[PDB]
Amino acid sequence: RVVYRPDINQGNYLTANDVSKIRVGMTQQQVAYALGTPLMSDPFGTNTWFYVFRQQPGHEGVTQQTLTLTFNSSGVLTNIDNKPALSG
Amino acid sequence: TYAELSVTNPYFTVDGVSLGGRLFYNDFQADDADLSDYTNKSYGTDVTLGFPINEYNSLRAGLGYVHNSLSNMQPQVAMWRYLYSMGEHPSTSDQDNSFKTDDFTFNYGWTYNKLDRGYFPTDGSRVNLTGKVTIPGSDNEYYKVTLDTATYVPIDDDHKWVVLGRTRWGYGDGLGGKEMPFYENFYAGGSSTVRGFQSNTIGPKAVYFPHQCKSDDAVGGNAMAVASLEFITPTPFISDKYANSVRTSFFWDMGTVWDTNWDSSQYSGYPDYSDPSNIRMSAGIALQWMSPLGPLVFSYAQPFKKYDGDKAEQFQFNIGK
Amino acid sequence: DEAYLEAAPLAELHAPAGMILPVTSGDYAIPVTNGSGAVGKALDIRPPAQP
Amino acid sequence: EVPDNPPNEIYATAQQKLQDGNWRQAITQLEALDNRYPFGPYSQQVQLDLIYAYYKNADLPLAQAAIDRFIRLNPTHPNIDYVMYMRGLTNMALDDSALQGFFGVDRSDRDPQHARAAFSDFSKLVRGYPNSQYTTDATKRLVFLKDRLAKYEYSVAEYYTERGAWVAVVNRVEGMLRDYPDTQATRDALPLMENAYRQMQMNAQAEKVAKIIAANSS
Amino acid sequence: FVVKDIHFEGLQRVAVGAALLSMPVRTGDTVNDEDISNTIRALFATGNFEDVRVLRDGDTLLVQVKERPTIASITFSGNKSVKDDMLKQNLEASGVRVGESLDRTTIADIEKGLEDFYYSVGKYSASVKAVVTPLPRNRVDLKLVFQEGVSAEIQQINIVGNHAFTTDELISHFQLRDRKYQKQKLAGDLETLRSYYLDRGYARFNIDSTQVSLTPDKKGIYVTVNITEGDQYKLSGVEVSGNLAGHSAEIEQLTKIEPGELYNGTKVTKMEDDIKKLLGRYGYAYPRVQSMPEINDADKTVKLRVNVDAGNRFYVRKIRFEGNDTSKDAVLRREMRQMEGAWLGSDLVDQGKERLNRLGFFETVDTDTQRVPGSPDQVDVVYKVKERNTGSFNFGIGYGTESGVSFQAGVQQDNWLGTGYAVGINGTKNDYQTYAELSVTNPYFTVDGVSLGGRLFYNDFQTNKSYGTCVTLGFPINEYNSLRAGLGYVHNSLSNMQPQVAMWRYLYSMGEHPSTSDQDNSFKTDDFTFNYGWTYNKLDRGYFPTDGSRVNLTGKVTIPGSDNEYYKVTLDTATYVPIDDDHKWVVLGRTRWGYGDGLGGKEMPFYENFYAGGSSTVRGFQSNTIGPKAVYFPHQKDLCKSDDAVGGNAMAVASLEFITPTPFISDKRTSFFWDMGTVWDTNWDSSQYSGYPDYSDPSNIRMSAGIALQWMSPLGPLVFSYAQPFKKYDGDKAEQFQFNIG
Amino acid sequence: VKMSPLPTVENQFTPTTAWSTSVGSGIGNFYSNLHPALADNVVYAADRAGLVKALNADDGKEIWSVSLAPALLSGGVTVSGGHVYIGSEKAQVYALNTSDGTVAWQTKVAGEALSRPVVSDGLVLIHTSNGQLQALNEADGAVKWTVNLDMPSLSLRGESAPTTAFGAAVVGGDNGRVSAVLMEQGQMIWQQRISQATGSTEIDRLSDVDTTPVVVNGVVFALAYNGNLTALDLRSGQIMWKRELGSVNDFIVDGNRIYLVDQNDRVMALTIDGGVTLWTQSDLLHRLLTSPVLYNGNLVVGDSEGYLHWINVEDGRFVAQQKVDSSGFQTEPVAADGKLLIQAKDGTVYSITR
């Protein structure tokens, strides 16, 4: 549990001063401008973006900030679900 | 271990006049072959310029400088005769001995690479000829000539039944009394030259002096004339549809090596190894093949006529030279 | 060589109820159009007999 | 074979050498014939013969250039469908060129580029000249290529499944659901899309991808 | 007049349909002599022959053309100053396409064009002559030959208007030596002068002219260049603003230099490049950075404005490999330290590339980045590689009735079947010695890099026989340093060896009091070994280190009930330091420390002794001959002595060497060094002796001095070394120069 | 490459050298207009290193050794009363004193002063190889006025020495446009392009009016390396007639007859008007010639190999030879009253008489 392994970093670099840019009713293209493009999007038949910020350096504890936002058809932001930590 | 360094510029002059410099490093134990046991260590340089005269020919020329250093030559007639010639008092009774030379030289040669295919050649000819002469100076005043020939002639315009001739000639004595006995000498037997005779086993076997009689260990010789007539065919069984790259050949080889200066007077009691009449003979079957990992050869021979103690090597295999 | 026969036949996923798979594009092979030609080692590798 | 210009009747002995499989003689005689008579009546047939002879001589890098030269010489030759088939099969033949054919360790994991080019060419044939008697084998090519590319994408998704770049695996396995929605590799891959949501705690997606696998797996 | 039919003949180069489509008036239209002439002119546009005739004698028109050989190929009668491939591609570009139409006018045109081209390359006096020959079925062949003389030697460069420095300094830095003219070299040397003046700090420097002149004899070219220097400008503190990403503290720490120092062009370039790289390190892969100097006559003071727009943060959507053949993608993507789906750490991508070159199986690695088409925010990075094909393979068997078998075998391949193995097999049967070894390492048994390896060997002289097996775990433990542990087994038995005192005391040390006579010794043991080892790869250089220190250390201990109990330590070190802030010229210190000693009341076994001498250990002595000399019991009466090498139980070496890519040749490689090494035998005690060496202490520090040469070779990077032993003792065999690979 | 076979003839004139002097260093092989000059029995010669010496015409005895220094003394000597003027390829112009050779001043011009200075009504005209005319006042070296002519990036050495008449200069220029300029304030009066050109991407764009033109009776004669001999109206600059036969350099006109050298390196002579030859010499070709002199009645020219030709003034007969000189010449000889002067490559000066 000391054998070295490279840092893991995954997903969009969310930050506490950008996420406040997300507010209901923005058009999806301007959300793409506000937070950059999503590294994950739901393939299974509905228009949702899964922003994830995740780091796991060395062997220190995994840290995560997942940010789920739903667009209705035609691309208007309907909601914001923020989980500020891993489920643990 | 063996090492060398070579680099060439195709145009020292715009006529294709290339200049190639070769430096080398050699560490040789004669016990690593059938050769009578002594250590030979050497290094040196040749500067060589290579250029054509017509078509595919090349000429080459080049000075060279070389270092040689010898140690622990087992006490036998030939080696002490080399010392004598050089005028270094032999330690005949004790093999605790050493000897070095620095030597200075020129070489010349010819190539007539009228060949057709690097692999499975059917209609082509090659001649490789090189001469070495020491230039007035050096420690050793030897001269050497080496000639190698290969010719392909198809009996069938379908180029399946090609005859492979080879011959191999050489000779070297030197100016005055500084012979070429012990440091540059030709060998026969192995997978190259006549197959079926052990590596370098053909030639004179030296005579001991009593130490702190005739022995069957080879010293090599300074006169040589290897030959091989090799007859090549379609293979009778293999899956020609795939195997058309695999070569099968029937061959008959000639080997002779001799020493001009084996004195049948002083050595009246020991075999007349200066006679070239003792030609060794071998003939047999060989396969040669290219495979993704490397090229392969297999060859068995009956060495059907040979002289006493000539160590046979009935079957050879090698990959990747 | 034969090794490209016996490749497993394609079998389209079944979309589960209440959702659908992505749109599909690019490396899609059009069906054989009832091509009656030879297969494998039976194919005549030689060039056309004449223009 | 002397370079000395031969009468055009050389085609008879040249064609014989081709039929008997004297590939070096065939290729060097046909090359000479074309270069000596590049635009005569025996231009196009000699070119197609040189293509085949270079293909049986296994000198594939020269067959690639030869086909490219043929296409740009004649985009509309009446047997151009054969030329396309040969370019596709020439691409794949360069893929399988490894020495592993005796060891039997697969090479599905190696660089896919030549496989992808072969697939594109065979697909362009199957769309362009489908009534050709070459289509059916070309479809047998296409299904194997579309399997091999998916096994490569699966292998990378498996590697990132081991390192834990769980976004990288979800993204690539989703790519396999866009491009190769019907192959075996994708059916082995959906367990990866599952695990890769699990370790990221996107249970809102895990409950979908479990349903998609469970409704489909035999 | 209306024509109902047209008569053609020939049509060799152009078909009838082409004539019908090209002609402005077709069959059935109203035509006259003017329209017929227009139809002739239109036919000319197709490219047909110039001579034509038309006749009108009824309802039909007859037209004839003079066909002639026109289809051409190009050949040249020898070329020295210009190569064949450039000649033919140039000829194609000039208009003579192989298979294009040709004419005498075209012969003159191409002659003139070749003359022009020749003039372009600096042989202003060349001349061109061409002729054509016909070919069967209406074809032609072209042959042209050249007359030329000496190409223009440049002379004085006459730099004018300078007042700092003088001519010789500027022309010394120019690749155009007061030699052959080349316009592109003129541009390159115009930039080398500008950059020199900007580095010295004449930031208002300007070049307002340049021209070349040919003596009337056209044998040579005078160059000239006017200079306006301007005043001695002086730097002022750099000021930064724009769309920064909040990194102002690091940007200012990186950009700020003390004021009053002189301006320098490469200094500003290196600062702007570091600013964009630092933005590149945090994920801004394509920043828009601009710099403009404030130029002031007041105090001649110069203050740069640097504007940085960081742009978007770029995410690497997809990593692909191209050229990854004979190697499975797993091995390259596991060595790749940069993750898919992360923000693009630019120098994390370069750290990946560096680790791939570290692996060393690839002939070259190049890194490309490109944006995905039609999306503004995501980057695609691909690596292009070439295979070394390490798999040097040799094998040979002979089989004879009187020589039942002989063989040699040797197979080392990395990534044997790809994957990532290292397989190494060697073997031999001479008549005097049998040998064999096999080794297998799978260095990524777990993706974290926990290497596994195993070796088997068998060694059997016709006397000494030994066989054994060991394995290791190599788990990395930081970015740089690495660590290993291991275990194994070896067996030995010896027999009828020379009655050396060092061995006899060893044998005695088991309590096996030997027979001190008649060579009748025989002794066999099984030994079981634990390994530890430690390592420090911190050299930061692909081939020849410049400014890093490497350390390497190895242990063994044999506690687990072995037939002998002993230990060993090796420490190995190579510390490199540059000449002041310039890593192109460097000095290093290479050192070692060996020690080994008895346990369990025993003495360390002789066959594990350290050896000194040769390129491997100490430059300027024969290989392994620098250990303390042996000693023998009398036989074909005292404790007889002989100058023969037996390894020592403890060892030290220190050598200091300067590595020098000396630009005596064009820098598109030698060294010099001091050297010292010693070997000593702890449990060799002088109290038993009188008139024998000081084996008990390393006092006998012996040295050499000399030089070495390094070169690149197919198999491995080679070193060449020369020395003479300025500090050596009795019986210390040496010769002056020796070779080694790596 | 081709070369002349060194023509030969019996030495009818049997010319002999009166005196010679080894002033110092030579010009080497640097093609440079560095001819010496004479004034009232004292002759002036210069060495490219910087050495300059004043010699007496009848014995070659020197009186100066000033070096002015490298400085690359070039643009050979010109003398006008009490002042000696000479350029330098580091853009400097020196004024020296005929009496004793002391420096009067040093002044700076726009680039290297290859063109031989010409003295005219208080102005010293110096066509620098940047293509700018500058005039330096004869009294004090300050530059009075400047004119800029456009340059092709590749040209011959723009000697193009100007000449003055009726208060106006005419001068060459490497683009091939002869230009006439009032001496007072440098106002350009007319330009005319000397010839066709541009059969090449650059080298056949050579159109260089390299020679010094000359003016007789208001009629200008001009030359250009690739172009033609031409006649122009001094007042208007419109061309009058062309001469295709030879165009290289340094022509001379005397006795209403024109003499010039062909780019092929052959001498010829042109009639009163219109470009037609009355004779043409041969086998001079492809070997460096120099400007002819026409000193005492015989037309004489120097050969790079080391010798002089002596040609009949009215006819092309080649009469005398072999006044050989050490290493030969790269510079103009000069004419003098009843005397001839010429300088070798090595710097040794010689005089020939009969």
Side-chain angles (χ1 to χ4, degrees), chain E residues 598-630:
Chain E
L599 302 172
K602 281 178 51 68
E603 284 296 4
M604 166 165 176
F606 49 82
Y607 53 93
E608 281 280 6
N609 269 307
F610 302 95
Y611 291 60
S615 179
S616 310
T617 75
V618 67
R619 304 161 255 277
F621 292 107
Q622 301 313 88
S623 302
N624 94 345
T625 83
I626 302 310
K629 315 297 160 58

Side-chain angles (χ1 to χ4, degrees), chain C residues 4 7 10-14 16 21 24-25 27-28 30 32-33 35-37 40 43 45-51, chain D residues 45 49 52 55 79 82 85-86 119 126-127 133 135-137 139 141 143-144 146 178 180-183 212 216:
Chain C
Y4 72 93
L10 291 304
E12 277 39 42
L13 293 165
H14 294 292
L21 308 191
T24 64
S25 62
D27 300 353
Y28 48 80
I30 302 291
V32 75
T33 82
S36 61
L43 178 163
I45 310 155
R46 295 176 296 175
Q50 187 174 359
Chain D
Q45 222 59 2
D49 289 339
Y52 173 115
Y55 144 82
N79 287 268
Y82 165 90
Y85 177 90
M86 283 303 170
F119 177 92
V126 173
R127 294 173 256 297
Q133 62 269 23
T135 168
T136 308
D137 188 71
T139 69
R141 293 286 179 310
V143 299
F144 174 58
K146 208 177 72 171
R178 288 193 177 87
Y180 311 159
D182 57 317
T183 189
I212 206 179
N216 203 150

